[PDB]
Amino acid sequence: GHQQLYWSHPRKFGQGSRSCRVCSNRHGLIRKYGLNMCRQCFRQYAKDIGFIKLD
Amino acid sequence: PGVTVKDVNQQEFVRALAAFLKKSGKLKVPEWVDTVKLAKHKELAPYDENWFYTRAASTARHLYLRGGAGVGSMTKIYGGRQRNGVMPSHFSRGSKSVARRVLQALEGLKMVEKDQDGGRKLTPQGQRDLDRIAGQVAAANKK
């Protein structure tokens, strides 16, 4: 359709407004500390950010 | 042997303060005291008839202990355990209009004045009244 209905549905909130900043997934996001990363991608990269295991 | 409020048992102290506040009645008691619940989480109206005097006495004692307490703070003091029925219990706050009206009646009695910052505290003569009642309740408890 034209510009009037192609993206007309609001996505100013909710689960459809947020996606993983890495894998573009909409499930298991981590928004704490503005991380905005998927649950699995955070496990993948957590060494690089600095989140390391102590206990 | 001077007596402050901190040297008397606060329970019968606030009861005696409420009794004095009753007998020297100059309050602005609102017309809906016989209807409202003292807080959201309550399920019955307070059993005592003139509970407004007791609540004002308690707020005066709390303002003596620490100043600068606003209406939202007084809801924190008079909050309690909401049972929520079948769902698990939680914490609820006191009635905002009740706290506001108690405070407003207190500055109507001019024993409480607002701060330069937020909230309100006691005046020197309010402190004097609290200390006098504490002294007399200590004397009564002794003899």
Binding site: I30, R39, F42, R43, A46, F51, I52 | -
Partner: protein, 104 residues
Amino acid sequence: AIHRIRITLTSRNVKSLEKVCADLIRGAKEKNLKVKGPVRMPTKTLRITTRKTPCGEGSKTWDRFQMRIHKRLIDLHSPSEIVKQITSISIEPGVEVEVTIADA
């Protein structure tokens, strides 16, 4: 100028912060500025607990990740001016520094 400045250091490791908070104040003493003592703010412990599995099948094991953020405050106070006196930073990677004045 009559200047009184504040330098805050913050990082994820304690070794680098300790050696910076050592060498900076030592340089100040050798450059005769009277030094307000290094103040250690409480550590910020960012905790993220997450299911280990990428599937949801398993025995419900949770991996917990921590980030420790440590920060120190050093107030440099001299009767003369400070900014034209001290200019070198001598800052290694991994630590962030912010310099304000007593006004801010």
